[PDB]
């Protein structure tokens, strides 16, 4: 009926005008997340675990591989050396729930080199039909990711899973107008003028953007189940 | 050896001086958490689930029940109508890891009434030994909780569980100098001058503080295992 009045209670009791209130810097979060990301990156063996799974993804998606190509395979992978900057955090009425729900809008900007080495073979018809050409390693890269991210912690039941719950979730999503800049080149440098190098670059860019839009871009949300932060002794540690 | 230099990389790349940098307001977080807390409170049946578990706790702790008491039992329970305000968020070198780890120090202030109704019986020796007196309902309350909270997201392995892992955790803890103000009274109001009403109040205050210090207060941390926020289709929803 009129939950929203209940909804304001929140705003009034947390000193958030929600219009007048200025945006907030979020820098401490940049730092904590940066710390976990550097931890994540310092496990060297991890990249192999990642490359294995990315090749699993490609195997599952093999039928979507263009006809001129015999095979694609990730051989090397760069996870970068820079961190994602979150900024400009605004609370707004989620657009649009008729004031039922509150969400945070956040700016995100990542300037780094993330790269994949891709061993590539062509599907030729000479001398025999269905001949796999000699391999050629192509490095494909992302060099900037800028986006806007709405976040909230809800119970769901207002949102239905697309392709195959009780509890509380982190709901997040990106506005469809995101910037994701790619860059493409041969591994060798004498191979740089080969015909299919940009073809590969654009394939990969396409797929990555498609994966992304299918999972995180409005009107699609990620719904990630949260644990209780209630103090329990089985979670107690010291040092 | 000198990871810390690796540690600075973070600070330099996230524009955090860590000394000069000012504290940050955190209000959006107050709002999101307030939203989940109001959601948590709008399930009416939930309080019964809570009271059941609190009576389970008391059953487990029954041997610690003072001699003059026959039995204690929670009958009613108030979860409050106000929200916890987080503020003043500083990033600091965790004290002290020799610069290895970074944590956030946060102020927290809750002004609310949280209450429990406790049906209480005395253990008497007249007429017979081990006689349970008539019951009396005592309401015990917390009316302010002010504390300082260090938080970080680590991998552990530097911290060992006290009383009965691989992955990444939310680590949080409170400084030992916390404010937790209690208040105590009879349910009826003609029963207000009964001898054992403050005795009960102080028992409950003691136990609650003890539970708290045993779980969240330095040098003890809560270590809560986090899920991957990596976009996977089994987590994708829409509306
Ligand atoms: C990250 C910066 C803040 C540091 C985190 C310290 C804890 C802050 C959150 C405190 C909110 C008070 C709610 C605690 C009492 C209920 C806890 C609970 O049952 O969890 C329910 C709910 C789900 O638990 P379950 O369904 O009962 O298993 O979880 C949450 O409320 C998550 C709270 C947000 C914490 C993530 C912060 C990032
Ligand atoms: C004076 C009475 C005040 C009212 C206290 C309850 C109302 C507020 C607390 C919310 C409901 C508490 C029970 C919810 C948890 C499910 C039941 C359960 O687990 O009990 C078994 C649990 C034992 O499980 P075990 O630890 O695994 O052995 O026992 C308790 O949790 C007893 C809790 C005593 C009352 C808590 C006092 C609340 C202090 C408020 C400030 C604390 C900040 C802590 C930070 C939280 C976020 C970081
Ligand atoms: C809450 C406000 C921010 C909105 C949240 C949107 C996502 C922000 C975090 C993005 C950080 C980039 C790391 C994502 C790529 C690795 C993800 C992963 O594997 O999780 C590892 C790790 C554990 O995953 P596992 O051990 O591989 O299962 O989880 C995290 O890194 C948690 C990241 C913090 C998210 C909580 C924010 C509150
Ligand atoms: C051009 C090449 C750029 C390099 C791309 C990888 C380097 C950065 C990504 C980090 C490592 C990626 C794999 C880690 C996940 C484990 C493997 C896996 O799950 O694959 C199976 C997974 C399929 O699992 P399913 O969704 O359950 O079917 O497939 C993928 O995840 C493919 C990912 C394509 C490459 C991602 C492009 C990175 C964009 C960076 C900005 C995206 C922001 C997203 C927000 C994150 C935090 C909120």
Swiss-Prot record, chains A, B:
GO MF terms, alphabetically ordered: lipid binding
GO biological process annotation, one example: protein insertion into mitochondrial outer membrane
Localization annotation: Endoplasmic reticulum membrane
One annotated Gene Ontology cellular component of this protein: ERMES complex
Keywords assigned: Endoplasmic reticulum, Lipid transport, Lipid-binding, Membrane, Transmembrane, Transmembrane helix, Transport
Residues the entry annotates as binding a 1,2-diacyl-sn-glycero-3-phosphate: 60, 211, 215, 230, 232-233
Membrane topology qualifier: Single-pass type I membrane protein
Family stated for the protein in its record: Belongs to the MMM1 family.
Designated name of the protein: Maintenance of mitochondrial morphology protein 1
Underlying gene: MMM1
């Amino acid at each position: 009926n009129e939950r929203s009045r209940q909804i304001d209670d929140i705003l009034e009791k947390t000193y958030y005008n929600v219009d007048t209130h200025p945006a907030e810097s979020l820098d401490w979060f940049n730092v904590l997340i940066g710390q976990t990301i550097q931890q994540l990156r310092e496990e060297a063996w991890k990249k192999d675990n990642i490359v294995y799974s990315l090749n699993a993804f490609i195997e599952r998606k093999a039928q979507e591989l263009p006809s001129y190509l015999d095979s694609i395979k990730i051989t090397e992978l760069d996870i970068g050396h820079d961190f994602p900057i979150f900024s400009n955090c605004r609370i707004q009425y989620s657009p649009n729930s008729n004031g039922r729900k509150l969400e945070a809008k956040i700016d995100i900007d990542l300037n780094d080199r993330l790269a994949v080495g891709i061993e590539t073979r062509l599907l030729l018809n000479y001398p025999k039909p269905l001949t796999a050409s000699l391999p050629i390693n192509v490095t494909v890269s992302i060099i900037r990711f800028q986006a806007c991210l709405t976040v909230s912690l809800t119970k769901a039941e207002e949102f239905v899973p697309t392709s195959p719950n009780d509890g509380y979730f982190l709901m997040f999503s990106f506005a469809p107008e995101y910037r994701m800049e790619f860059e493409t080149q041969s591994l060798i440098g004498a191979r740089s003028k080969l015909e299919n190098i940009p073809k590969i670059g654009s394939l990969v860019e396409y797929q990555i953007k498609k994966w992304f839009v299918e999972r995180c871009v409005e009107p699609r949300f990620q719904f990630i189940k949260l644990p209780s932060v209630w103090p329990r002794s089985k979670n107690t540690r010291e040092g």
